Paper text:
Interestingly, initial attempts to obtain crystals of the protein-FK506 complex failed, as the intermolecular interaction appeared to be strongly favored, leading to the production of the same apo crystal forms.
The 12-kDa FK506-binding protein (FKBP12) is a ubiquitously expressed peptidyl-prolyl isomerase with considerable homology between fungal pathogens and is thus a prime candidate for future targeting efforts to generate a panfungal strategy. PPIase proteins all catalyze the cis/trans isomerization of peptide bonds N terminal to proline residues in polypeptide chains. In addition to its role as a PPIase, FKBP12 is a member of the immunophilin family and is the target of the immunosuppressive drugs FK506 and rapamycin. Three extended loops, which have been called the 40s loop (between β2 and β3), the 50s loop (between β3′ and α1), and the 80s loop (between β4 and β5), surround a deep active-site pocket that binds both FK506 and rapamycin.
Residue numbers in the entry: 3 to 122
The structure:
């Protein structure tokens, strides 16, 4: 079963974990596998707040931030509040064959360097 890959750069508090319906606040840089940046909250000067686990972000983000809607998965570490991680998300858990014209091409793997600042 398809899952994003998660590299834990530095662990957070190891006790606060988002569940579906929670709001999270996160800084990120989104790049293609070739290092070309397609988006970033940091250059925007403000972190990104979203509701997780309910399809209001790409599935790869939902799975990563909620640890597969609480179900976990093989080699899928939990991301606690304060954690720095790198999420690598296959196209089927992102924008698929369709992509986003002029921003993300077809069947693109996305790499997000993230810091989870807040959970609820």
């Amino acid at each position: 079963e398809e899952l994003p890959q998660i590299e834990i750069v530095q662990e957070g508090d190891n006790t606060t974990f988002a569940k579906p319906g929670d709001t999270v606040t996160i800084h990120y840089d989104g790049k293609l596998t070739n290092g070309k940046e397609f988006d970033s909250s940091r250059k925007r000067g403000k972190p990104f707040t979203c509701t997780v686990g309910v399809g209001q972000v790409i599935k790869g983000w939902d799975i990563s931030l909620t640890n597969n809607y609480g179900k976990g998965g093989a080699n899928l570490p939990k991301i606690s509040k304060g954690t720095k991680a790198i999420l690598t998300i296959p196209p089927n858990l992102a924008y698929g064959p369709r992509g986003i014209p002029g921003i993300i091409g077809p069947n693109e793997t996305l790499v997000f360097e993230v810091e989870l600042l807040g959970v609820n």
